[PDB]
Structure formats: C-alpha cells, structure tokens
Design a binder for this molecule. Structure first.
Ligand SMILES: CCCCCCCCCCCCCCCCCC(=O)O[C@H](COC(=O)CCCCCCCCCCCCCCC)COP(=O)(O)OCC[N+](C)(C)C
Ligand SMILES: CCCCCCCCCCCCCCCCCC(=O)O[C@H](COC(=O)CCCCCCCCCCCCCCC)COP(=O)(O)OCC[N+](C)(C)C
Ligand SMILES: CCCCCCCCCCCCCCCCCC(=O)O[C@H](COC(=O)CCCCCCCCCCCCCCC)COP(=O)(O)OCC[N+](C)(C)C
Ligand SMILES: CCCCCCCCCCCCCCCCCC(=O)O[C@H](COC(=O)CCCCCCCCCCCCCCC)COP(=O)(O)OCC[N+](C)(C)C
Ligand SMILES: COc1ccc2c3c4n(c2c1)[C@@H](C=C(C)C)OOC(C)(C)C[C@@H]4N1C(=O)[C@@H]2CCCN2C(=O)[C@]1(O)[C@H]3O
Ligand SMILES: COc1ccc2c3c4n(c2c1)[C@@H](C=C(C)C)OOC(C)(C)C[C@@H]4N1C(=O)[C@@H]2CCCN2C(=O)[C@]1(O)[C@H]3O
Ligand SMILES: CC(C)CCC[C@@H](C)[C@H]1CC[C@H]2[C@@H]3CC=C4C[C@@H](O)CC[C@]4(C)[C@H]3CC[C@]12C
Ligand SMILES: CC(C)CCC[C@@H](C)[C@H]1CC[C@H]2[C@@H]3CC=C4C[C@@H](O)CC[C@]4(C)[C@H]3CC[C@]12C
Ligand SMILES: [K+]
Ligand SMILES: [K+]
Ligand SMILES: [K+]
Lengths: 435, 267
C-alpha cells in the first residue's frame, strides 16, 4: 500500500528477457564444442503463416484475441488508481486476463520454433511486447496487486491486421494493402503512445511519486491528436518530468515516422473513381451508344445537331463511353442534358463495359473519329477494332463509323457480320471531302 | 422546463427516416410478387435541372431560400438558452420558419420523383439534411418548444452554389467552376462544423447536462479557423466530452478532405 512494488512487475519483465536471451545463447555455445526438430520447425512455419486451415483458424484466432485484450485495458485504465491491492478470487478482469496470456504464451513458443534465427527472434518487437505483458500478469497472482505498468503494449497487436489479413487473401489490390498498413500504424501509435503518457503522468516522478497529474486515458488520447495536428491548445499538457521527456521523443520520432511515409501518402490518396455502374432504366424507350473521340467540342457539336428544334421530336437517349474522365467543362455539359445524356467510364474493347451500357439493346453504336490526328492510319485502325469488338458482342447491331481514309473501308467490308443492308454505314471523310 | 424533450425532436427526425425508407422498400417488394408515372418522372427531371424557365425560376428560388434559411439560424443561435418554451402565436421567427420548410418539403418530393433509384435517393446527404430540419419544425408546433437541435445542417445548402449556378450557365470556364466548388465546400464545412461544436458545448454531457460551456456561435466560428490553421491559441477550447470527441473526428476528417483537394489547389 504505502510502499509500491512497481519494480517487481517491471524487474520481472526483464528477467524473462536476459534469461531467455542467455539460455538460447548458451545452448548454441554448447553445441560449438559439444530428426523431428527439422520437421517440427517446418510445421511451425506453416502453422503461423495460415497456409492450412488448422493454421488459418489460428491466425484469425490471434486476430480476434488481439483486439479483445485491449478491451480489458480500457476498463482497467478507467480506474483512477494506477496501483491496486486485491486478491484474484474476487477480481473478474484478472481471471479473464489469465485466459488470454496463457494462449499468447504458447503462441509465442510456436513462433519461436518457426524462427530460423533464434537470437534475432528474441530481439523483435513482437517478442518484447509479450516480455512485458506475460510475466507481470503471472506476478500479479503472486504479488496480489494490480498495476497498469506497460499494459498499453497490447495495442501493438493491431499492426498485424495488414499482415494477418494478407494471409487470408482479403487484401488483393496494392492500394488496399498500403492503406491498411498506413491506417493500422497510425491507430496503434496513437493508442500506444497515449498509454505511455497516461502511465507517466498519473504515476509521477520516480522515488517520490508526489506530483501526480491525474489524467483520464481518453483525455490523453485527445491530448495526442491535438499534439499530432500541431494545434496545441494547452488546456491539457504534461507536467511531470518523465511525461515531458517522452513527449520530446514522441515529437522527434513522430515526424521521422511521418517523413518515411510522405512518398507513399502522396501517391495513394490522390485517386478517385467517379464514373461507373451499369445502365439501368425503364423499358419502352430507345437509346444509342457513342464512343471513339469524346472531347468537349466533339460532344457539344454532336448534341447541338442531334437535339435540334427542326428535327422530328423523338425520344432517343444518348450514352457516351470513354476511357478517360471528363474535365470540368464536359461534366457541366452533361448536367445541362441530364434527362437526355448520360456518361460512363470504360472502353469498347472490354466486353464487361459493353454489357454495362447495354449495347445489345441500343439502336446503333456511333464511333467518332479524331479528324485532327497526326497519323490517320493509326486512328483508322483503332476505330476499326472498335467495330470488331462491338460486332463480337452482338452480330445484330447498327454501327456508324467515321473513316479517315478510303482504302481502310475494305477492311470493314470484309467483316463477316458487317451488312450495309441492315443499317451499317461508313462515312469516309476523305471520300466525302474530295467528292 | 426542468425535463427536456430534446429526444422528441431528435427521435422524430429518424422516424421520418426509417419509415420513409421502409415504405419505398416495401412497395418495391409488393410489385415483386404482385402511363403518367413515366411522364411525371421525366417532367420532374427537367424541373429540378433548370432546363426550362418554369424550372429555371425554381432552382434559383431554392438558391435564394437556401441562404435565407441560414439567417434565421444566426438570430436563433444568438440566444444563450439552447432550449426554449414559447407558443407559436407570439414567436416571429417560428412563423417565418413554417413558410420555408413547407416549400422545401414539397421540393423534396419533386426531387424524389425525378430520382431513378428511390432507395439510393433516400440515402443521399441532401435527403438526410431535410430529414433533420423538416420534421422537428413541425414538432415544435406540437411540443410548443424551441430547440437548436441539428439546425446547422442548413449550411449544407451552400454547396449547391457551384451546381445550381452551373445550371444557369454563369460558370463557363473550368477555372471558375473549380474555385467555386472549393470555396463553397470550405465555407459550408466551416459553418456546419461550428454549429456542431456550438450545440455540443452548450448542451453538455448527456443525461446530466451539468457541465455546460456557454459559448457564442461566432466564438465557435473563430475557434475552428484557429483550429484549421493549426495555430491553437487555447483561449477557446472544447471542455465537454462530446465536444472533444467530435473535435477528434473533425481533425481526422478535415485533413482527409484537405488531402483530396491538394492536387487541385496546386494547379
Ligand atoms: C481511436 C480514437 C477515436 C476517437 C475516440 C474519441 C476521442 C476521445 C474523446 C475523449 C474526450 C475526453 O476528454 O473525455 C474524457 C473521458 O470521458 C469519456 O468517457 C470518453 C469516452 C468516449 C469513448 C468513445 C470512443 C470509444 C471507441 C473526460 O473524462 P472525465 O469525465 O473524467 O473529465 C474530467 C475533467 N475534470 C478533471 C476537469 C473533472
Ligand atoms: C521505431 C521506428 C522509428 C522510425 C523508423 C523509420 C520508419 O518510419 O518506419 C516506418 C514505420 O515505423 C513504425 O512502424 C513505428 C512503430 C512504433 C510503434 C510504437 C510507437 C509509440 C510511440 C513512440 C516504416 O515501416 P514499414 O511500413 O516499412 O513496415 C515496417 C514493418 N512494421 C510495420 C512491422 C514495423
Ligand atoms: C464566414 C466567416 C467570416 C468571418 C466572420 C467574422 C469571424 C467571427 C469573429 C467573432 C469573434 C467573437 O468571438 O465575437 C463573439 C460574437 O460577437 C459578435 O457579435 C460577432 C458578430 C460578427 C459578425 C460579422 C460577420 C457577419 C457575417 C463574442 O461574443 P460575446 O460578446 O458574447 O463575448 C463573450 C466573452 N465573454 C464570455 C468573456 C464575456
Ligand atoms: C464526407 C467526406 C469524407 C472525405 C471523402 C473524400 C473527400 O474529400 O471528398 C471531397 C469533398 O468531400 C466533402 O464534400 C465533405 C462534405 C462534408 C460536409 C459536412 C462536414 C462537417 C464537418 C465534418 C471531394 O468532393 P468533390 O469535389 O469530388 O465533389 C463531391 C460532391 N459533393 C461536393 C456534393 C460532395
Ligand atoms: C508534431 O508532432 C507530431 C507527432 C507525431 C505525428 C504523426 C503525424 N504527425 C505528427 C506530428 C503530423 C505531422 C506533421 C504536422 C508534419 O501529421 O498528423 C497526422 C495526423 C497527419 C499524422 C502523422 N503521422 C502520419 O501521417 C503517419 C501515417 C502512418 C502512421 N503515421 C504516423 O504515426 C504519424 O507519423 C504520426 O506519428
Ligand atoms: C488541423 O485540423 C484541420 C481541420 C480541417 C482543415 C481544413 C483545412 N485545414 C484543416 C486543418 C488545413 C490543413 C492543413 C494545415 C494541413 O488548412 O487550412 C485551410 C484553411 C487551408 C483549409 C483546409 N481545407 C481545405 O483546404 C479544403 C479546401 C476546400 C474545402 N477544404 C476544407 O474543408 C479543408 O479540408 C478544411 O477542412
Ligand atoms: C530496451 C528497450 C526495451 C527499453 C527498455 C527500458 C524500459 C522498458 C524500462 C527501463 C526503465 C523503465 C521505467 C522506470 C521507471 C518508471 C516510472 C514508473 O512510475 C512507471 C514505469 C517506468 C516509466 C518504467 C517504464 C519502463 C522503463 C522505461
Ligand atoms: C447515420 C447518420 C445520419 C448519423 C446518425 C446519428 C446522429 C444523427 C444522432 C445519433 C445520436 C444523436 C446525438 C445524441 C445526443 C446528443 C446530445 C444532445 O445534447 C445534443 C444532440 C446530440 C448530440 C445528438 C445529435 C444527433 C446524433 C449524433
Ligand atoms: K502548427
Ligand atoms: K500551434
Ligand atoms: K497554446
């Protein structure tokens, strides 16, 4: 009570460190001067990697129990007293805590077997975290006391989420893996460093423990987010010498962590998928699909002639399909024709995009050509391939295409599904211009 | 008076949400096992898009009444009491407020007709904003009380300016459209989030409402601009648990909003 035993919990933690370090170190030295082991190591490697279902349930089990162990901390940190004196029999949260640590103790041993280098496995962060949470829990039974100690290290489990879930094949695309990594580190650093300040501020200076800045754990969490954002209100601040000392390191380390992540946050957040989805509307009305050269003046000139007063009033919807996102001016043009013109992002050559815009039900597909092209041969070849893709999806579809040169008209006529008698038309600019 | 009815205003707002959500959801299910509608939907689409002059006057009318509705909030937020008990007959600002919400109620119905997907139209931000301002105003007649509630959401009208004015062909060049979009979002976020802090700080913690940090609305507006600029004087700060909790989300969301706009503010 009056005399605290915080050293007993702390000094026990490092006992498991150097003693465990030396036992593996000395055993290697014995073999220097003086089988199932190979099979067991290979079995342990695939067990912790989730290769098989017996290990797949194990890695997710670690995932479930990782967040769960943090829940015990949050109700423990709610108490104002950082040190408590109560027997195990009446305590509820302690009993649950015995169930977690023994599983993580045996799971730690399994990881040790799979490690090729025993010495470097001892000196990993995941090794350190169990060295500071498995021993003190057992000591709490002996000491009959409850101390917060270094219990915030359980938040370091959360950085396995991009790794554990990667073994489960849910993280396929590179964008998902990177963003999952970045988010998990930020949350874990935020939660772990908040626990350090909560312990340091409440405990006070060593050997006297008189200046105790009683602060709630969630107040500390609010304190760091103000600190990281560099706002610094000053309503909540560290007063203890130890708390300020850690805050100095946190400021330096935090920027260093941020600096290493600058190149990857730049090219990850600057993405957007604005246009997509399939064309779904009512039955009865008719629509056409326009592809090819889709620019601001290509659409505005087309829409002015298509939707004109002199033309007979017929309700035909215009659908545009281009692989590039429209600029600001083009989007405004689409808004002014919201009830008549719709846009989708995709390409004709992709059969998936053809089904989205409902090519098989459209009246005709119009292919616009880039008249001001450096290479007319290249432009014509690309446009011809679009007709092949359209005809591949459905042989009975009307296609109207602009061709820059007359000699390329022969290729279209050689298509087996091309039929001028059924509405297919070729408008050759070279033939018409010189005509 | 002693017992507050803030839940009555709040719980009524979500009543119009799930009930409205289920009615359109159940009607689709009925047709699964068991015309003027097409013409009406096409008419509604061009009405809200400003295609014709009858709809051109309507969209600008929404524009005029959008900023106007905010003026009522500013004089309501001036009062120190976030909850009031007064009859409609003597209250002036309430009577004006009845004139606005009924127009926005019928305008909301017009937007519903023009929507191709009824379910996703229910789950849009503009749908949510009316769900939190049209019901409580009608309840204030029944309850004979005045509460600020979630009234700051009317600042979310201001993000229609780059869209409504685009229908009016005043936004021609791409530079004007982009800068109008960026300015409108910043103003609306600044005004809306200031209202959240003003409501949270003045109301206090739930179920006890004892720790009430009485703060002026314009003081909160000055508080956020200091926060966004990362200056953080600390003279004005959030003390309630709920106010700090929202401030944590505002810091995270604000940088995320800023991050998405970095490539476009550069060029
Ligand atoms: C990941 C983090 C995501 C954001 C979580 C919310 C951010 C934390 C906000 C906490 C703000 C706060 O300070 O509340 C703190 C803690 O109060 C709480 O209960 C916080 C619970 C919020 C939990 C919600 C998020 C859960 C996940 C104030 O504590 P107090 O009542 O003891 O105040 C004492 C003040 N004196 C000393 C003057 C009497
Ligand atoms: C200690 C880190 C000091 C800075 C080193 C440079 C750096 O920024 O490292 C960064 C990340 O560094 C970290 O993970 C910091 C973890 C600290 C957790 C506890 C911090 C608490 C407050 C101090 C690059 O990491 P990575 O994405 O390449 O993947 C590494 C694998 N994990 C995620 C498991 C670490
Ligand atoms: C968009 C925003 C554009 C900028 C608008 C101006 C920025 C807001 C400045 C407000 C600064 C401010 O705090 O004034 C506040 C509010 O005072 C006001 O009247 C502000 C009116 C300014 C309106 C001008 C902009 C109108 C648009 C102080 O309130 P108080 O008198 O109750 O002070 C109480 C202090 N104690 C508690 C100690 C007694
Ligand atoms: C919620 C937004 C979370 C971040 C999403 C990424 C992001 O930054 O979105 C940005 C803008 O996100 C927003 O509009 C934020 C609106 C929040 C308004 C209320 C915030 C109050 C404080 C919280 C990109 O938007 P955009 O220019 O591409 O046009 C979208 C159409 N409008 C303007 C109607 C939304
Ligand atoms: C002044 O004191 C600090 C201390 C620590 C941090 C951290 C970040 N700042 C800190 C500022 C600041 C950086 C600035 C203002 C230059 O920005 O605030 C953010 C909210 C954007 C988080 C950022 N930060 C990261 O973006 C990365 C992403 C993965 C994990 N990250 C971190 O943990 C951290 O490095 C995080 O420690
Ligand atoms: C720390 O806490 C915050 C919280 C929110 C914001 C916001 C911005 N900062 C915030 C900082 C900071 C960003 C920094 C210091 C990295 O810069 O301060 C500005 C005054 C430049 C506004 C900026 N910001 C935007 O530039 C965009 C433009 C369109 C709408 N925007 C926003 O709403 C916001 O994202 C806005 O939320
Ligand atoms: C090599 C790596 C693991 C660092 C090891 C040193 C760490 C784990 C040890 C060495 C000295 C220890 C500190 C000694 C004194 C105190 C003050 C007490 O009120 C809270 C615990 C606290 C804050 C201890 C935390 C853990 C600590 C910092
Ligand atoms: C799904 C989207 C719309 C979010 C819905 C949840 C929102 C609208 C609801 C759920 C709980 C509600 C809060 C419950 C308690 C309080 C405290 C009171 O003093 C002010 C209102 C306030 C702050 C409410 C604001 C609105 C609120 C946050
Ligand atoms: K700063
Ligand atoms: K600052
Ligand atoms: K300060």
């Amino acid at each position: 009570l009056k005399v605290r035993k915080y050293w007993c919990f702390l000094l026990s933690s490092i006992f498991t460190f150097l003693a465990g370090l030396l036992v593996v170190l000395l055993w290697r030295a014995f073999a220097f001067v003086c089988t199932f082991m190979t099979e067991a190591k290979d079995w342990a490697g695939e067990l912790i990697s989730g290769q098989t279902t017996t290990g797949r349930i194990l890695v997710v089990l670690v995932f479930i129990l990782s967040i769960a162990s943090l829940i015990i901390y949050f109700v423990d940190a709610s108490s104002e007293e950082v040190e408590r004196c109560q027997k195990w029999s009446n305590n509820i949260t302690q009993q649950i805590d015995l169930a977690f640590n023994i599983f993580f103790m045996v799971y730690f041993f399994i990881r040790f077997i799979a490690a090729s280098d025993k010495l470097w496995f001892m000196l990993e962060m995941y090794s350190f975290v169990d060295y500071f949470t498995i021993p003190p829990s057992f000591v709490s039974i002996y000491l009959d006391r409850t101390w917060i100690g270094l219990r915030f290290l359980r938040a370091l489990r959360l950085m396995t989420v991009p790794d554990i879930l990667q073994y489960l094949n849910v993280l396929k695309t590179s964008s998902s893996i990177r963003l999952a990594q970045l988010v998990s580190i930020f949350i874990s650093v935020w939660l772990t460093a908040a626990g350090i300040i909560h312990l340091l501020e409440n405990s006070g200076d060593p050997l006297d423990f008189d200046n105790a800045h009683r602060l709630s754990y969630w107040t500390c969490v609010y304190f760091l987010i103000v600190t990281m954002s560099t706002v610094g209100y000053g309503d909540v601040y560290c007063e203890t010498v130890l708390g300020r000392t850690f805050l100095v390191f946190f400021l330096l380390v935090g920027l260093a962590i941020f600096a290493s992540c600058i190149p990857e946050i730049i090219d990850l957040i600057g993405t957007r998928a604005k246009y997509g989805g399939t064309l779904k509307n009512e039955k009865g009305r008719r629509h056409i699909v326009v592809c090819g050269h889709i620019t601001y003046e290509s659409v505005s000139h087309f829409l002015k002639d298509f939707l004109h007063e002199d033309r007979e009033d017929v309700d035909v919807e215009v659908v545009f399909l281009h692989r590039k996102p429209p600029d600001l001016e083009l989007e405004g043009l689409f808004k002014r024709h919201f009830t008549t013109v719709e846009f989708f992002q995709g390409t004709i050559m992709n059969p998936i995009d053809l089904q989205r815009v409902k090519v098989h039900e459209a009246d005709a597909c119009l292919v616009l050509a880039n008249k001001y092209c450096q290479d007319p041969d290249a432009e014509d070849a690309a446009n011809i391939m679009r007709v092949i893709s359209i005809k591949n999806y459905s042989d009975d579809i009307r296609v109207i295409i602009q061709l820059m040169q007359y000699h390329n008209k022969a290729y279209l006529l050689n298509i087996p599904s091309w039929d001028w008698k059924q509405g297919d038309d070729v408008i050759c600019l070279a033939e018409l211009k010189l005509g």
